[PDB]
Amino acid sequence: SGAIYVGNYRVVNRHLATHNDWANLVWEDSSRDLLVSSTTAQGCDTIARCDCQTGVYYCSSRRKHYPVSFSKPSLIFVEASEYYPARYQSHLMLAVGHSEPGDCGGILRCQHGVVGIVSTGGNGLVGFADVRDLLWLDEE
Numbered sequence: 219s220g221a222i223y224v225g226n227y228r229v230v231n232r233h234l235a236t237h238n239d240w241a242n243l244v245w246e247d248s249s250r251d252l253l254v255s256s257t258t259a260q261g262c263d264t265i266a267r268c269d270c271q272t273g274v275y276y277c278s279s280r281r282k283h284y285p286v287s288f289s290k291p292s293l294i295f296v297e298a299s300e301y302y303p304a305r306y307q308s309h310l311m312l313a314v315g316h317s318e319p320g321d322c323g324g325i326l327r328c329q330h331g332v333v334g335i336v337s338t339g340g341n342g343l344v345g346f347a348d349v350r351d352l353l354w355l356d357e358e
């Protein structure tokens with residue numbers, strides 16, 4: 219589990235969104251596994267606006283933050299899970315790292331801020347849903 223709290227937005231994995239998230243919806247995209255809802259309190263996370271390919275992510279199944287090298291956001295094939303059939307997921311970045319289903323939502327960050335959140339995994343790989351292109355998270 220986990221979310222990004224930026225301004226009056228809460229960014230979560232679409233497959234982990236709650237009823238309150240759907241009842242306060244700002245934007246969602248199944249192809250990216252992302253959903254954004256509105257918040258009453260202001261958040262403290264800042265979004266990175268960069269093309270970094272190195273950073274650090276949080277892994278809840280190890281209680282550890284790991285430094286990783288990750289691919290550029292792309293259209294990647296992801297195997298069937300409890301939440302989606304086997305399909306192409308867009309704006310996804312891959313790295314070598316430990317992940318389990320419940321690790322979704324962990325933040326990936328670089329020197330500029332939050333890059334994205336854990337969205338996929340298995341077999342020593344971890345995939346992150348990028349958020350750096352969502353410029354509207356910084357305003358309104």
Ligand SMILES: COc1ccccc1[C@H](C)CN1C[C@@H](C(N)=O)CC1=O
Nearest residue numbers: 251299301317318319337338339340
């Ligand atoms: C942390 O990711 C791991 C790790 C190990 C095994 C499996 C997974 C994830 C949770 C499987 N998936 C892919 C997700 C998606 N974004 O399509 C939806 C889903 O259930």
Ligand SMILES: [Zn+2]
Nearest residue numbers: 268270328330
């Ligand atoms: Zn960066």
